[PDB]
């Protein structure tokens, strides 16, 4: 019983850990990246 | 009774990589 409870427990932490990092990694890329492409195009406009 | 500061205090060299003697001149 302890073995089953452990392995199922570990998977969720691993799954949640991946899920959280993927979200925060990508949202920074989308939002900050858009501003980067925005800043550079004003730089190109200059 | 008077306890003067040591060399590590004196120069505050901190953590630096080892550097070759030739650089000195």
């Amino acid at each position: 019983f302890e073995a089953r409870q452990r392995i199922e427990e570990k998977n969720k932490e691993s799954s949640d850990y991946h899920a959280k990092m993927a979200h925060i990694v990508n949202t920074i890329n989308t939002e900050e990246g858009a501003e980067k492409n925005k800043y550079e195009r004003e730089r190109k406009l200059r | 009774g008077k306890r003067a500061i040591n060399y590590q205090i004196l120069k505050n060299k901190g953590l630096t990589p080892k550097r070759n003697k030739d650089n000195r001149n």
Partner: protein, 313 residues
Amino acid sequence: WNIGKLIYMDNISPEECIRRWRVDLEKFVPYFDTFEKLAKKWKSVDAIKERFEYDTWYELQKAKISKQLEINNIEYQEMTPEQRQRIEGFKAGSYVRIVFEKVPMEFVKNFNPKFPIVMGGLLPTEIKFGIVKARLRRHRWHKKILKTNDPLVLSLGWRRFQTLPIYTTTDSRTRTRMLKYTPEHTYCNAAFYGPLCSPNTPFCGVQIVANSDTGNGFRIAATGIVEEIDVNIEIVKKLKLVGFPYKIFKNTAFIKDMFSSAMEVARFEGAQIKTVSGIRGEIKRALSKPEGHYRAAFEDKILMSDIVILRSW
């Protein structure tokens, strides 16, 4: 009949209070008049028909604080001086007499005017005692690294005390593992028992305070910030069980001295293991004869000189 006084006159009952200047909060809904009366009261709704640039961000925050501070002065101005002192208390700059009781007689006797007497107020958290787990580093100028379970005089808030800290690492943010000593030139997680404190409260550690044992060395031993407060910690240590092979059959091998009885093996049937060479293996079953011996299978053949280890905490 001002209610400002009556509210705090506990001798007068609240029901007695209300009537003069004219049941229970567990009932969330407040009391209401009888239904039909409310309907007659609210045939006409007319009674309640009446109800229906700063240059930088920084100064805006400064403006908000100042505007808030100005509010306190305005109301404090009109409040009666006794009423003010009741609410705000004694403001800084006031010369005050403080009387204390149950002071040790040694303080009165062993009083030296040269040594200052500093009094510092305590918030509720400083009263609580518990586990203070914190980020700490050996001071750069201190000669030696600190050791776990080594007494250390710590300066927190208004209070100074000696405590036995335990220094820990996160182990890739997986567990709180105990360290034998401080890292030479970096911070480490440090746990100790003492008066609790708010986060963001910095502190120092000193190993010796007496003049006799001062020596020639620099004394401030450790520096850190309280990062956490709690009243348990689950600091754990790595415990490695060691056994030896005596009979090896290709992947399968028999190991001895890992355990004392077959019952010990049975608890650890299914457990992961490896050799010093790094060959991962598994406990399959406990051998009946002799006690403590168990069968294990490895990803590759192990050698007689190989030592097998079971990692536990």
